[PDB]
Amino acid sequence: RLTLMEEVLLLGLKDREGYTSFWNDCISSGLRGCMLIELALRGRLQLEACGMRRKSLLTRKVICKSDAPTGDVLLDEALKHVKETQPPETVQNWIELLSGETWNPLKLHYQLRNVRERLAKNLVEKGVLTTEKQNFLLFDMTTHPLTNNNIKQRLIKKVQEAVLDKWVNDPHRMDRRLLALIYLAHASDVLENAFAPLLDEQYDLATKRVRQLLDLDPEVECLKANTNEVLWAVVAAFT
């Protein structure tokens, strides 16, 4: 069982050793989106609903509806902040707060540090990576190669299939965890990795279908009964 952070991250891992995979500003923002979506789906957060009469997803405030620990150390750091911080803040503000995109001393202690290490630790715990302490000729570093090749391949197929053979014209008919996964992977720019192994024709098709999913309107779409509003807020924030 993988968190959306872990699935985004894995999508961005190209070889085994990961020496041609790179961190950057899209994905570290990407991952903070993933965390709010994770917290939402688990009934930890909701959007305020009191004046929505006039307000957008982008302007509505995030409410901690439960502070129950989840057993993911980052999910818990993030939730613990969304519990003390008050008054409440909007989705974009959280994504910023949590990635340290402030110059205000008061907001600094909100930023989540060592995201890469902690995720990689998580994946070692789950048996997806290992540890190779290494002594290179020019520096020491400790790496985490991919050992569990099946789960990676399963993940890639999962994403591939959702916009190909399993595709259905209707988005809410499809598992939310997977829809949010597509949006974030794109926002984090690792999605394109799921598609490069594809044949030309599938490649275009998938792409058409994704772009179509990007053309949806979260304001329209967060109205279907039984969806997560925070999810579409997070989609709004990265569109």
UniProtKB/Swiss-Prot annotation:
UniProt keyword Phosphoprotein, yes or no: yes
Instruction: Tell me which positions the record assigns to the signal sequence.
Output: none
Consequence of substituting R32L: Loss of function in vesicle budding, abolishes phosphoinositide binding and localization to the Golgi apparatus
Extract the GO molecular function terms from the UniProt entry: cargo adaptor activity; enzyme binding; phosphatidylinositol-4-phosphate binding
Origin: domain of life: Eukaryota
Where's it found, cell-wise?
A: Golgi apparatus, Golgi stack membrane; Golgi apparatus, trans-Golgi network membrane; Mitochondrion intermembrane space; Cell membrane
- What are the annotated disulfide bridges? C26-C50
The entry's keywords: Cell membrane, Disulfide bond, Endosome, Golgi apparatus, Lipid-binding, Membrane, Mitochondrion, Phosphoprotein, Protein transport, Transport
Q: Which GO terms describe its cellular component?
A: cytosol; endosome; Golgi apparatus; Golgi cisterna; Golgi cisterna membrane; Golgi membrane; intracellular membrane-bounded organelle; mitochondrial intermembrane space
PTM note says: Phosphorylated.
Instruction: Specify the inducers.
Output: Activated by depletion of mitochondrial DNA.
How does this protein lie in the membrane? Answer: Peripheral membrane protein
- Gene Ontology biological-process entries: asymmetric Golgi ribbon formation; cell adhesion molecule production; cell migration; cellular response to rapamycin; gene expression; glycoprotein biosynthetic process; Golgi organization; Golgi ribbon formation
Query: Quick one: which residues bind a 1,2-diacyl-sn-glycero-3-phospho-(1D-myo-inositol 4-phosphate)?
Result: W23, R32, R113, R116
Q: In which tissues is it expressed?
A: Detected in muscle fibers of patients with mitochondrial diseases; not detected in normal muscle fibers.
Residue ranges of the region described as Beta-hairpin required for oligomerization: 132-143
Q: How does it assemble?
A: Homodimer. Interacts with the coatomer complex. Interacts with MYO18A; the interaction is direct and may link Golgi membranes to the actin cytoskeleton. Interacts with GCNT1; may control its retention in the Golgi. Interacts with VPS35.
Question: Beyond the main fields, what else does the record say?
Answer: Modulates sensitivity to rapamycin. Tumors expressing this protein are more sensitive to rapamycin in vivo.
Query: Which protein family is named in the record?
Result: Belongs to the GOLPH3/VPS74 family.
Its job: Phosphatidylinositol-4-phosphate-binding protein that links Golgi membranes to the cytoskeleton and may participate in the tensile force required for vesicle budding from the Golgi. Thereby, may play a role in Golgi membrane trafficking and could indirectly give its flattened shape to the Golgi apparatus. May also bind to the coatomer to regulate Golgi membrane trafficking. May play a role in anterograde transport from the Golgi to the plasma membrane and regulate secretion.
- Write the protein's name: Golgi phosphoprotein 3
Source organism (scientific name): Homo sapiens (Human)
Q: Which gene encodes it?
A: GOLPH3
The residues of the intact protein that this chain contains are 59 to 297 of 298
